[PDB]
Design a protein around this nucleic acid. Structure first.
Ligand code: FES
Ligand SMILES: [Mg+2]
Ligand SMILES: [Mg+2]
Ligand SMILES: [Mg+2]
Ligand SMILES: [Mg+2]
Ligand SMILES: [Mg+2]
Ligand SMILES: [Mg+2]
Ligand SMILES: [Mg+2]
Ligand SMILES: [Mg+2]
Ligand SMILES: [Mg+2]
Ligand SMILES: [Mg+2]
Ligand SMILES: [Mg+2]
Ligand SMILES: [Mg+2]
Ligand SMILES: [Mg+2]
Lengths: 107, 122, 85, 99, 128, 96, 23, 72, 137, 48
RNA sequence: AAACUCAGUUGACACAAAAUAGACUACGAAAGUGGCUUUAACAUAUCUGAACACACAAUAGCUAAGACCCAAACUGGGAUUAGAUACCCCACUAUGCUUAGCCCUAAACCUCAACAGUUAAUCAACAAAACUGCUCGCCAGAACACUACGAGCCACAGCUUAAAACUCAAA
RNA sequence: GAGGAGACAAGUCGUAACAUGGUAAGUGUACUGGAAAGUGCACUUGGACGAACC
């Protein structure tokens, strides 16, 4: 259950000192906030260690380098898949809310 | 009034434990307590390594002494328990049964706070 | 003075230390220990602590009420029945 | 707050409109509507309930009176002399099937 | 103070109480009771000593007697807790309330006021 | 007037209040099992009332009893006692 | 509200303390 | 209404019942409604004890053939 | 039995055995993940030292120490040092919330050692020893 | 009743006479205050 | 960068502070009060009422004697900058704690006085909807001015009370 | 004798405040400093923390 707001705020007829001091009114808005906005590092470290121990010569590093390339490709593919899959979203939720606006006044 | 002494004694042999219990109850009576009951909660590993009288303890025997004593005797009893070596720990509390189960019909629902802001239109 | 390896201890299942560490971090986060350590790094003066607690409580109230409203209105996300009017 | 005089009471947190009062109110309203229609005034039905928009429009078209169930553009009555021509005639009675 | 062996006000009216065991008497005595019970016994003694109707707790005399017992308790507390500012305030406020009640009783019923002053050892003094 | 008029009376359909699980039961600082039922298994942190579901009075009593046991040596502080891990789960918590 | 009056009082008080220290 | 207490007890004892509510029928009579009618006519007969009336109504409806399968 | 995340009860008939050793017998890996530095020390069931490592010892200097890469390097070094001591299975007991908190374990694994348990032991004062004043930037 | 009930109990108090017997009896016996609570409000007592 | 050779595990170990509970909204007149136990204890009325007295009054500060983990004005060093008497880093002192006295100030603000009552016909704006009765306290343009003089005070670079001249049409 | 205030008025050194005023601002109190001021302890919002989960 939602925390009780009874007697929390500073109001006339409230003997107790304020429990909450909301810098903004505690009234629901008609909108929600927009969705707020390093991979492959282990593979990079592995490949760099192989380079370090082989004098940065691909001859033995072939495997680690191939793993690095595969990991980079996987990261790019995951980026694309996430971007496409992202498009309830804030736009739809706000559209739903606008049909049922909060009414802090009297009709 | 009525007190319960929760006592944690050094885990020791039956003769030593009996001697310590006799000593503690005798001190209570001398200070004026009227011992009502003595229940043994058994020996068990302490929840943490208590160190009493420079001696560390991992296990101890838990006992309860329900008694009635004058208010002034509680401090003296606490001091004597502290000074007693065989007692790992000891606390005198007000006996729980002196408290009552005053009726609590349930979890009454708290309605959403109303009239917390003016009805001004914006 | 407590028994070691009982508190905040997670047994990694089948060697998936990643999953074990994530579960342990979840446990600590739910218990609030991570936030407690982060705040305790530097002293939070009592007035600032009170202000932060008040702000967090107000934020919790608002977010819980907004989530309640969102869930309550979710059913109305259906397709329009009276299309054409 | 202003519907308290017309609410017979509450049944399980649901209000019951006093049909006793509704009878007299509807008698007066229907008598007034009949008088206006007899006098040939313009009667305009109004309802933003999309469920019954079509039904109200059909009823108005059948009874030879006008209906406005769509989005009510601002000034459609106060600014009518501009939105319809200076000589437009406004409705003589408006019937809100949904207020 | 009343003797420690004094029975609690609740049990002083119990029939056949005198026949009970010595240990039971001790447990029901003030010796095994907090200071509040001793204060209540004191208040009952003052009531039976002074007021015309000892069962009239709501009278001005009963109020004055109870407040005097409370003031005595606060003075006893402060004799030991010399730094208890809250209880110092309570003692001073109680003394002021006793003065006001005594003034009202003096204005209303002078004979009862004399009896109250004598019984509670209060020496009424006019304000400067 | 009219026999069918409503009659003043209390809601006969009112439902009984959902008494908290511990309501009407004696919380004791020695019932270390019950006290451990309301702490975090991993950190020994006392659960909030939103988790426990307890009424305010019983939540306060549970907290005070937990503190008393912990400081008097009846209960551990930093973790739930292992022996009570498999006790019935009455806290609405889900770590895994 | 703004704190212009508090700022004026602040400057007054600071100058007074400085003058007292100086004399 | 007076019958609301009887309705509350009936719903507590036997639940909503197997038979649903056909509110579209203005003259629909529910199992609880028949229980209330039987209770009322028994009260008219004269029984004044609440529990006695409840048990008598249950027995009479069971004889009539009502499925008063108690929830508990 | 389905997996139980809780550690085995001390002094109890537990069936779990790692290379035939009991949980109380498995060696320990104390990781201190300070804000700018990470340190790893492997000790025995009797807290006998087995190996030590840190960002500084591995060679990262100044800000570079407080990085996941340095933590993984220290973990690898500590694991390699412990392997010569014969440590296979270890119970990780990490304290601190530095950037190396998890990279230390990852390096300790890449070095070959297997982890059986993670035990956070970050010192959380219930209250005491007032910390330093807040930084204003 | 309160004084009467107390009168019966006092017979079973610990005094300097039955001190040894009662100490031995307490050592020989045990008391377990632990009992779990289920989500249904039922009290699960430990097996004894 | 300066700085320490000290750092990690385990054990012993406070006169410092009091996670979680607390999404609780309680106690106290206010300041304040959130580890545990005990003792004492939370004025009165079915009103208001004090520079006109008595008792309190966060933090800071003063005197004396102790404690000193940690923090920390000041001070020193490192860094920064055009300069940096600061912001960032390190060390440390008064001080924060205890005892006994002083000091009596806070944006001591919930900037919303106490008691009683109403929601009825509203309301400059914002803020925490608008009012009725009653009593006390306080205010009469801005600045001069938490100032000068006088007075009182364990206060001595202080606190309370507190003006006037000159100036302006504003604030 | 000297200080204080206000006014007139330009320079001077800085940029302390007004925006998160570039270290949020301010109250009390103490130390310090060319100068607005810096910092320490407590207090206020006459700041914000973007206000479902993320
Ligand atoms: S619901 Fe009744 S005691 Fe908590
Ligand atoms: Mg000035
Ligand atoms: Mg008064
Ligand atoms: Mg005054
Ligand atoms: Mg003071
Ligand atoms: Mg010092
Ligand atoms: Mg001042
Ligand atoms: Mg002055
Ligand atoms: Mg003077
Ligand atoms: Mg600036
Ligand atoms: Mg600034
Ligand atoms: Mg400041
Ligand atoms: Mg400085
Ligand atoms: Mg304040």
């Amino acid at each position: 259950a939602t925390p009780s707001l009874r007697g929390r705020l500073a109001r006339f007829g409230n003997p107790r000192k304020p429990v909450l001091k909301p810098n903004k009114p505690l009234i629901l808005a008609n909108r929600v906030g927009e969705r707020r906005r390093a991979t492959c590092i282990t593979e990079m470290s592995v490949m760099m260690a192989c380079w370090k121990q082989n004098e940065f010569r691909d001859d033995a590093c072939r495997k680690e380098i191939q793993g690095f390339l595969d990991c980079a490709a996987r990261a790019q593919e995951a980026r694309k898949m996430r971007s496409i899959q992202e498009t309830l979203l804030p736009n739809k939720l706000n559209k739903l809310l606008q049909r049922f606006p909060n009414k802090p006044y009297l009709s | 009034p009525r007190y319960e002494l929760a006592l944690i004694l050094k885990a020791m042999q039956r003769p030593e434990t009996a001697a310590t219990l006799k000593r503690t109850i005798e001190a209570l009576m001398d200070r004026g307590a009227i011992v009502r009951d003595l229940e043994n909660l058994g020996e068990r590993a302490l929840p943490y390594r208590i160190s009493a009288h420079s001696q560390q303890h991992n296990r101890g025997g838990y006992f309860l002494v329900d008694f009635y004593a004058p208010t002034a005797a509680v401090e003296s009893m606490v001091e004597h328990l502290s000074r007693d070596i065989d007692v790992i720990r000891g606390n005198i509390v007000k006996h729980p049964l002196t408290q009552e189960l005053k009726e609590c019909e349930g979890i009454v629902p708290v309605p959403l706070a109303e009239k917390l802001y003016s009805t001004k239109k914006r | 003075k407590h028994l070691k390896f009982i508190a905040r201890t997670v047994m990694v299942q089948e060697g998936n230390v990643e999953s074990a560490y994530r579960t342990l971090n979840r446990i600590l986060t739910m218990d609030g220990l991570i936030e407690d350590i982060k705040h305790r790094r530097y002293y939070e003066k009592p007035c600032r602590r009170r202000q932060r607690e008040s702000y967090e409580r107000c934020r919790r109230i608002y977010n819980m009420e907004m989530a309640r409203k969102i869930n309550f209105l979710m059913r109305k996300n259906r397709a329009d029945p009276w299309q054409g009017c | 707050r202003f519907m308290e005089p017309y609410i017979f009471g509450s049944r399980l947190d649901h209000d019951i409109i006093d049909l006793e009062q509704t009878a007299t109110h509807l008698q007066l309203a229907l008598n007034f509507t009949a008088h206006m229609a007899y006098r040939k005034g313009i009667i305009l039905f109004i309802s933003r309930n999309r469920q019954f928009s079509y039904l109200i429009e059909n009823m108005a078209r059948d009874c030879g009176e006008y209906a406005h169930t769509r989005y009510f553009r601002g000034g459609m009555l106060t600014n009518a002399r501009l939105l319809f021509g200076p000589t437009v005639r406004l409705p003589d009675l408006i019937i809100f099937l949904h207020t | 103070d009343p003797p420690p062996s004094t029975l609690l006000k609740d049990y002083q009216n119990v029939p056949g109480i005198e026949k009970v065991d010595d240990v039971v008497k001790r447990l029901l005595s003030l010796e095994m009771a907090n200071k509040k019970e001793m204060l209540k016994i004191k208040q009952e003694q003052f009531m039976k000593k002074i007021v015309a109707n000892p069962e009239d707790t709501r009278s001005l005399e009963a109020r004055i007697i109870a407040l005097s017992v409370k003031i005595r308790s606060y003075e006893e507390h402060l004799e030991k807790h010399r730094k208890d500012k809250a209880h110092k305030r309570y003692l001073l406020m109680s003394i002021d309330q006793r003065k006001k009640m005594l003034k009202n009783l003096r204005n209303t019923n002078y004979d009862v006021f004399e009896k109250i002053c004598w019984g509670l050892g209060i020496e009424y003094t006019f304000p400067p | 007037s009219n026999e069918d008029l409503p009659i003043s009376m209390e809601n006969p359909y009112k439902e009984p209040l959902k008494k908290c699980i511990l309501c009407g039961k004696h919380v004791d600082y020695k019932n270390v099992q019950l006290l451990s039922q309301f702490v975090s298994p991993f950190t020994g942190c006392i659960y909030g009332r939103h988790i426990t579901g307890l009424c305010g009075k019983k939540q306060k009593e549970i907290t005070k009893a937990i503190k008393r046991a912990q400081i008097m040596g009846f209960m551990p502080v930093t973790y739930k006692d292992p022996a009570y891990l498999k006790d019935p789960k009455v806290c609405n918590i889900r770590y895994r | 509200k703004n704190v212009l009056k508090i700022r004026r009082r602040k400057m007054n008080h600071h100058k007074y303390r400085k003058l007292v220290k100086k004399t | 209404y007076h019958e609301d207490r009887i309705r509350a007890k009936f719903y507590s004892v036997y639940g909503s019942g197997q038979r649903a509510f056909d509110l579209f029928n203005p003259n629909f009579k529910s199992t609880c409604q028949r229980f209330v009618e039987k209770y009322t006519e028994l009260q008219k007969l004269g029984e004044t004890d609440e529990e006695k009336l409840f048990v008598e109504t249950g027995k009479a409806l069971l004889a009539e053939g009502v499925i008063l399968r108690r929830v508990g | 039995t389905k997996f139980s995340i809780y550690p085995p009860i001390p002094g109890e008939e537990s069936s779990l055995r790692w290379a035939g050793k009991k949980f109380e017998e498995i060696p320990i890996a104390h990781i201190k993940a300070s804000h700018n530095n990470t340190q790893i020390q492997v000790v025995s069931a009797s807290n006998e030292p087995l190996a030590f490592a840190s960002c500084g010892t591995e060679g990262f200097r100044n800000a570079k120490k407080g990085t996941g890469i340095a933590a993984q390097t220290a973990g690898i070094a500590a694991a390699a040092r412990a392997k010569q001591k014969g440590v296979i299975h270890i119970r990780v007991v990490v304290k601190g919330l530095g950037p190396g908190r998890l990279s230390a374990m990852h390096g300790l694994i890449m070095g070959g050692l297997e982890v059986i348990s993670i035990t956070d032991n970050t010192p959380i004062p219930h209250n005491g020893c007032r910390p330093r004043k807040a930084r204003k930037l | 009743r309160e004084v009467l009930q107390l009168q019966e109990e006092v017979k079973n108090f610990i005094t300097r006479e039955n001190l040894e017997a009662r100490v031995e009896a307490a050592l020989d016996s045990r008391k377990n205050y632990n009992w779990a609570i289920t989500r249904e409000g039922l009290v699960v007592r430990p097996q004894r």
